[PDB]
Amino acid sequence: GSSGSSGTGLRPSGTVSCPICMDGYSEIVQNGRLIVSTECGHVFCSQCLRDSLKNANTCPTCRKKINHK
Ligand SMILES: [Zn+2]
Ligand SMILES: [Zn+2]
């Protein structure tokens, strides 16, 4: 529910980053696309990635044999 916690911020750890739409996290998870991941070791979006596989089977970043089946 809505506890109502008032903290300071969020650890500098980091936030997902998609080179396809070069957009942050909130945006992606803003009722548009789902945050997906790959084996190669990169982060992408549901649409972005799903679309890449159609165009360039290999990762649009490392371009390494990638397949989830
Ligand atoms: Zn994306
Ligand atoms: Zn990759």
Coordinates of C-alpha atoms and ligand atoms in Angstrom, one line a residue:
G1 CA 0.0 0.0 0.0
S2 CA 1.1 3.5 0.8
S3 CA 3.2 3.5 4.0
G4 CA 4.5 7.0 3.5
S5 CA 8.3 6.7 4.0
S6 CA 10.4 9.8 3.7
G7 CA 14.0 8.9 3.0
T8 CA 16.9 10.7 1.5
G9 CA 17.5 9.1 -1.9
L10 CA 18.7 5.9 -3.6
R11 CA 22.1 4.3 -3.4
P12 CA 24.4 5.4 -6.2
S13 CA 24.6 1.8 -7.2
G14 CA 23.2 2.5 -10.6
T15 CA 20.2 2.3 -12.9
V16 CA 19.3 0.2 -16.0
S17 CA 20.4 1.7 -19.3
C18 CA 19.2 0.8 -22.8
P19 CA 21.4 1.8 -25.7
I20 CA 18.4 1.3 -28.0
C21 CA 16.2 4.0 -26.7
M22 CA 18.9 5.6 -24.5
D23 CA 16.2 6.1 -21.8
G24 CA 16.2 5.8 -18.1
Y25 CA 14.3 3.3 -16.0
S26 CA 11.1 5.1 -15.0
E27 CA 10.5 6.0 -18.7
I28 CA 10.8 2.4 -19.8
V29 CA 8.7 1.1 -17.0
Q30 CA 6.3 4.0 -17.6
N31 CA 3.5 1.8 -19.1
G32 CA 5.4 1.3 -22.3
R33 CA 8.0 -1.4 -22.1
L34 CA 9.2 -4.0 -19.7
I35 CA 12.8 -4.2 -18.3
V36 CA 14.5 -7.2 -19.9
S37 CA 18.0 -8.6 -19.7
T38 CA 20.4 -10.7 -21.9
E39 CA 23.0 -13.3 -21.3
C40 CA 25.8 -11.4 -23.0
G41 CA 25.6 -9.1 -20.1
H42 CA 23.6 -6.1 -21.3
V43 CA 20.3 -4.4 -20.4
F44 CA 17.5 -3.7 -22.9
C45 CA 13.7 -3.1 -23.1
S46 CA 10.9 -5.5 -24.1
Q47 CA 10.2 -3.8 -27.4
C48 CA 13.7 -2.5 -28.2
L49 CA 15.3 -5.9 -27.7
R50 CA 12.4 -7.9 -29.1
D51 CA 12.8 -5.7 -32.2
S52 CA 16.6 -6.1 -32.3
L53 CA 16.4 -9.9 -32.5
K54 CA 14.3 -9.4 -35.7
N55 CA 16.8 -7.0 -37.3
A56 CA 20.2 -8.1 -35.8
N57 CA 19.9 -11.5 -34.2
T58 CA 23.1 -10.8 -32.3
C59 CA 23.2 -8.2 -29.5
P60 CA 23.1 -4.6 -30.8
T61 CA 26.0 -3.9 -28.5
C62 CA 28.5 -6.7 -28.2
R63 CA 27.0 -8.5 -31.2
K64 CA 27.7 -12.0 -29.7
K65 CA 25.8 -15.2 -30.4
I66 CA 22.7 -14.6 -28.2
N67 CA 19.6 -16.7 -28.1
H68 CA 17.0 -17.6 -25.4
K69 CA 15.3 -20.8 -26.3
Ligands
ZN1 ZN 15.0 0.6 -24.9
ZN2 ZN 25.5 -7.4 -25.4

